Enzyme design. Structure first.
Site, PDB file in Angstrom:
ATOM      1  N   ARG B 256      29.317  28.966  39.503  1.00 56.01           N
ATOM      2  CA  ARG B 256      29.411  28.636  38.087  1.00 56.01           C
ATOM      3  C   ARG B 256      29.354  27.124  37.919  1.00 56.01           C
ATOM      4  O   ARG B 256      30.375  26.453  38.038  1.00 56.01           O
ATOM      5  CB  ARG B 256      30.724  29.182  37.498  1.00 56.01           C
ATOM      6  CG  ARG B 256      30.746  30.692  37.212  1.00 56.01           C
ATOM      7  CD  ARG B 256      30.498  30.997  35.725  1.00 56.01           C
ATOM      8  NE  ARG B 256      31.017  32.297  35.289  1.00 56.01           N
ATOM      9  CZ  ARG B 256      30.450  33.481  35.547  1.00 56.01           C
ATOM     10  NH1 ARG B 256      29.328  33.571  36.277  1.00 56.01           N
ATOM     11  NH2 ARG B 256      31.021  34.593  35.079  1.00 56.01           N
ATOM     12  N   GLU B 258      29.110  25.776  35.223  1.00 50.56           N
ATOM     13  CA  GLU B 258      29.937  25.599  34.024  1.00 50.56           C
ATOM     14  C   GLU B 258      31.308  24.992  34.387  1.00 50.56           C
ATOM     15  O   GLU B 258      32.118  25.629  35.063  1.00 50.56           O
ATOM     16  CB  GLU B 258      30.155  26.930  33.251  1.00 50.56           C
ATOM     17  CG  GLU B 258      29.400  28.189  33.712  1.00 50.56           C
ATOM     18  CD  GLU B 258      27.896  28.127  33.458  1.00 50.56           C
ATOM     19  OE1 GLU B 258      27.388  28.955  32.671  1.00 50.56           O
ATOM     20  OE2 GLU B 258      27.218  27.257  34.044  1.00 50.56           O
ATOM     21  N   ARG B 264      41.914  31.205  34.783  1.00 51.07           N
ATOM     22  CA  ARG B 264      41.260  32.432  35.263  1.00 51.07           C
ATOM     23  C   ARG B 264      39.765  32.266  35.602  1.00 51.07           C
ATOM     24  O   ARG B 264      39.058  33.269  35.807  1.00 51.07           O
ATOM     25  CB  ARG B 264      41.453  33.564  34.230  1.00 51.07           C
ATOM     26  CG  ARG B 264      41.429  33.098  32.768  1.00 51.07           C
ATOM     27  CD  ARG B 264      41.700  34.222  31.764  1.00 51.07           C
ATOM     28  NE  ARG B 264      43.061  34.771  31.851  1.00 51.07           N
ATOM     29  CZ  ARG B 264      43.414  35.831  32.583  1.00 51.07           C
ATOM     30  NH1 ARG B 264      42.511  36.482  33.327  1.00 51.07           N
ATOM     31  NH2 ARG B 264      44.682  36.244  32.577  1.00 51.07           N
ATOM     32  N   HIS B 265      39.286  31.021  35.696  1.00 47.30           N
ATOM     33  CA  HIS B 265      37.866  30.754  35.990  1.00 47.30           C
ATOM     34  C   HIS B 265      37.660  29.540  36.920  1.00 47.30           C
ATOM     35  O   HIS B 265      38.416  28.563  36.859  1.00 47.30           O
ATOM     36  CB  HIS B 265      37.074  30.586  34.676  1.00 47.30           C
ATOM     37  CG  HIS B 265      36.460  31.860  34.165  1.00 47.30           C
ATOM     38  ND1 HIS B 265      37.022  32.605  33.150  1.00 47.30           N
ATOM     39  CD2 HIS B 265      35.328  32.508  34.524  1.00 47.30           C
ATOM     40  CE1 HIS B 265      36.265  33.659  32.907  1.00 47.30           C
ATOM     41  NE2 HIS B 265      35.230  33.622  33.726  1.00 47.30           N
ATOM     42  N   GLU B 406      37.858  41.453  31.372  1.00 48.99           N
ATOM     43  CA  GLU B 406      36.574  41.678  32.006  1.00 48.99           C
ATOM     44  C   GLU B 406      36.605  41.475  33.522  1.00 48.99           C
ATOM     45  O   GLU B 406      37.079  40.422  34.015  1.00 48.99           O
ATOM     46  CB  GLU B 406      35.555  40.720  31.393  1.00 48.99           C
ATOM     47  CG  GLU B 406      34.112  41.006  31.763  1.00 48.99           C
ATOM     48  CD  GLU B 406      33.160  39.961  31.220  1.00 48.99           C
ATOM     49  OE1 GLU B 406      33.470  39.368  30.148  1.00 48.99           O
ATOM     50  OE2 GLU B 406      32.097  39.735  31.868  1.00 48.99           O
ATOM     51  N   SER B 409      29.967  42.855  34.270  1.00 46.37           N
ATOM     52  CA  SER B 409      29.042  42.767  33.156  1.00 46.37           C
ATOM     53  C   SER B 409      27.697  43.224  33.653  1.00 46.37           C
ATOM     54  O   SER B 409      27.350  42.900  34.766  1.00 46.37           O
ATOM     55  CB  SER B 409      28.950  41.321  32.705  1.00 46.37           C
ATOM     56  OG  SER B 409      28.178  41.212  31.534  1.00 46.37           O
ATOM     57  N   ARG B 457      38.316  38.736  40.562  1.00 47.01           N
ATOM     58  CA  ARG B 457      38.682  39.214  39.243  1.00 47.01           C
ATOM     59  C   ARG B 457      39.212  40.654  39.298  1.00 47.01           C
ATOM     60  O   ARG B 457      40.284  40.992  38.770  1.00 47.01           O
ATOM     61  CB  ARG B 457      37.445  39.139  38.369  1.00 47.01           C
ATOM     62  CG  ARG B 457      37.731  38.900  36.945  1.00 47.01           C
ATOM     63  CD  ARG B 457      37.751  37.419  36.543  1.00 47.01           C
ATOM     64  NE  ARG B 457      37.577  37.377  35.093  1.00 47.01           N
ATOM     65  CZ  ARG B 457      38.534  37.613  34.194  1.00 47.01           C
ATOM     66  NH1 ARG B 457      39.797  37.820  34.555  1.00 47.01           N
ATOM     67  NH2 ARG B 457      38.234  37.608  32.906  1.00 47.01           N
TER      68      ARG B 457
END
Lengths: 485, 483
Positions: B256, B258, B264-265, B406, B409, B457
């Site tokens: 990621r 991002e 949590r990320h 989640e 996906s 996760r």
């Protein structure tokens, strides 16, 4: 210099009641037939006169005006479908079918009828489909960059071809294959060959059995960081740290990055590595013992679970089944001793040239009749600074390489778990302890004797199947000269 | 500013015959005892008066002059060893043992004797070892940066501590320094029985995922990460399907780019990915997930009961309820949240509080922790997503949720090149940027769908653990590359 996407033409079929091009699949009611799809491998004399419908590739269309023969493929299996003009199959039906482009995905309904004369090109030889309906699910563009048929030929067809060109009029002709970039630029098309789909199932098998076996031994799968911000050359450092975290027995299946700019015919800057690390009680051979068990499992189970795939590979690329019993154990010394007897001049602590590893393979095959062995007690000078030296001679170490068909598939060692000594060796190999403080410091607070392994997945599968080029065994071939696709 | 390695002191023990510090292990004859090593879990009233020898960590040394109590640990199991002065165990034997530093690895031989009074702190409560010999295999340095005992306490211990100070003599309890004193000594932290348990269960997810999909004749693949890095292994997954592989999965790292730190990320995690041909309908793919997850969830308690037991003491949680597997649409979900008072708008992504809220709604109505949201808005999904035939503002995609959050996906994807390219332009994406991908769909292209799961996760949400870093082995983010 922005290269646009090119989109080639598809055929213009005129659809009818029982022969239509379906609309693009959007998971919509018209695709909810409620039929039973029959798999091609099930088409067998057992079910003559039953009707079936099967979603397959139309690999080939040979056509005769009133009769059209469709060659169907799906995975490793192939069969024949026959469209014939009749009271119930029309001129328009036939000419629809004759105009289907190669590789179009279709749903073909028909009655399975027997064939007194076998169909030598198909895997299902004793039966063919008389079509009553067809529906094109995804209509292929044309022309293909490559024919599948001449992607699947074994060299032997080509040996007999180029030698038939002794003729020295029209020397017509023999057949040709296109070069590793015309296939690499269309990799996904290349992967459809039955040989290729088979090759990668067997790579999948190695991975799976490696996981299944070690799991049955209560090993714990771990996932260590690759963004170490540089990449993880070897997941070794963290593997060891997992053992200092009382995990006892761990393995990792992940990517390994060779920054080493290396193109011979068997090495690349990114591959998939199967790694193992474990506590050691009395002796590091406990770790070699797990390997033997481990590999024997992979090698026992592969033929039991994928017989057809092995069959399909052998046609394209002949090889004889790996001989893996006995598992021979030599020392580097003994190996040097043999090669010198074979005429090589080598010196006590030298790494082996690749040819020398193959020669030793041929020595070992002749004497013990195995393709599978382990070289123990390598020279310290060739091994990294974390390697535990041999107690009798510190010029040697507690490390080993494992070989399949006289070539390396894995490398491993007992490692240094005492921080003072690890640091002494770290300095002796000219490495800054500062560079890896945390790693060294993690051995301070009681530290298990341990050993382990690094296996190349591509390498083991390549050597298992006797395939000479590593690129045939990597899915989307990667190297410094090759980015796409 | 080059920070050198620090190396602390180890104790100076005076070795003897039955109590010695071994020389460094180099896989050498002196370590070839030919003894049978007994596992701590086997120490049970069944074998009182048998003699055993076991290689374990000396977690703790409580000492009494003539008696030394060694607290032994090994994986998730612990037991008690007793060294007592006698005709056959000397003053020098005892003081050797009293000077062993915490976390030293030892080989302890002794006779297993019963205990009428149970040993509440050990997992093996009904039996203890009377030592006859000891051998230090690796002597630990000291002092440890952190005590293992106060690394393992459940939150409740400190609530009950400070409230016991409703009360002279006071109960000061313990405490432990922030997540960096443990992160800077991660390998020490991972020795806690909880942690070794947590990561066996992470391993369980991975393995069961692999085992199940392999029982369904899926083929494991390995796609390149040096693409730049592979943000999502999605593109190549799809290309494997256009190579007639039919059903594939990959277990690999996902990156990621991002810059994302909430709680949590992270910028690197492990992804479990699936992709498959699709015959009639993309729910065929959802159907494989339900089967797939139910297997992971059914099997985990069967195969790792003790690990679950150990985790629950540290971090209480009730067992996941995963039957029924509920299927709603995004529309229905919006309908529920609106009815709950939220104003949301038809095609909006959900804030995290809204997902948790919907979790609570679903738990109350269907009493499951496990569901799937189908038919997401096109505008929130990527350009490869197959739109819904009835309404192109929606799409053939879905998210799966555990404890109202989640874990994966997925979607049916576009396999027609002209249309894929139309959408690729509508989402403002240069087709030139991915020529080879688009062009790979030109020569007959199977309808297909698939999944992206986060390992960290699923395991975090499975165990009801709130912080993702407790469920990643060597925690990675932009502020933390070390360790």
């Amino acid at each position: 210099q922005l290269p646009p996407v090119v989109l080639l033409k598809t055929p213009e079929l005129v659809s009818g009641e029982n022969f239509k091009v379906m609309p693009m699949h959007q998971s919509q009611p018209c695709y909810k037939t409620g039929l039973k799809y029959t798999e091609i491998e099930e088409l067998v004399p057992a079910m003559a006169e039953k009707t079936v419908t099967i979603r397959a590739r139309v690999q080939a269309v040979r056509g005769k005006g009133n009769m059209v023969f469709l060659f169907l493929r799906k995975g490793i299996y192939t069969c024949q479908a026959l469209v014939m003009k009749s009271e119930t199959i029309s001129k328009e039906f036939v000419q629809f079918c004759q105009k289907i482009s190669a590789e179009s995905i279709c749903d073909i309904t028909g009655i399975v009828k027997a064939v007194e004369k076998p169909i030598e090109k198909a895997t299902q030889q004793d039966v063919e489909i008389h079509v009553t309906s067809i529906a094109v699910v995804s209509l292929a563009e044309y022309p293909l960059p490559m024919q599948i048929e001449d992607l699947t030929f074994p060299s032997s067809v080509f040996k007999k071809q180029e030698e038939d060109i002794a003729k020295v009029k029209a020397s017509a002709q023999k057949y040709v294959k296109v070069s590793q970039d015309t296939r690499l630029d269309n990799r996904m098309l290349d992967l459809r060959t039955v040989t290729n789909i088979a090759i990668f199932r067997i790579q999948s098998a190695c991975c799976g059995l490696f996981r299944e076996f070690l799991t049955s031994q209560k090993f714990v799968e771990i996932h260590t960081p690759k963004l170490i911000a540089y990449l993880a050359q070897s997941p070794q450092l963290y593997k060891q740290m997992a053992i200092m975290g009382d995990f006892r027995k761990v393995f990792e299946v992940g990517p390994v990055f060779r920054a080493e700019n290396s193109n011979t015919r068997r090495h690349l800057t990114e591959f998939e590595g199967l790694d193992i690390e474990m506590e050691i009680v009395e002796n590091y051979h406990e770790c070699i013992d797990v390997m033997e068990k481990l590999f024997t499992f992979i090698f026992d189970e592969i033929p039991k679970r994928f017989p057809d795939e092995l069959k399909v590979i052998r046609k394209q690329y002949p090889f004889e089944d790996l001989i893996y019993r006995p598992f021979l154990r030599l020392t580097y010394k003994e190996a040097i001793e043999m090669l010198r007897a074979s005429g090589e001049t080598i010196g006590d602590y030298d790494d082996f040239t690749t040819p020398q590893e193959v020669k030793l393979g041929e020595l070992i095959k002749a004497k013990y009749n195995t393709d599978f062995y382990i070289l123990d007690k390598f020279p310290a000078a060739i091994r990294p600074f974390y390697t535990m030296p041999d107690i009798d001679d510190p010029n040697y170490s507690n490390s080993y390489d494992v070989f399949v068909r006289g070539q390396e598939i894995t490398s491993g060692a007992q490692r240094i778990h005492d921080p003072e000594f690890l640091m002494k060796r770290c300095i002796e190999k000219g490495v800054d302890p500062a560079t890896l403080k945390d790693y060294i410091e993690s051995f301070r607070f009681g530290s298990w004797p341990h050993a382990g392994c690094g296996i190349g997945l591509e390498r083991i599968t390549m050597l298992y199947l006797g395939i000479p080029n590593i690129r045939k065994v990597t899915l989307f071939p990667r190297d410094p000269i090759r980015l796409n696709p």
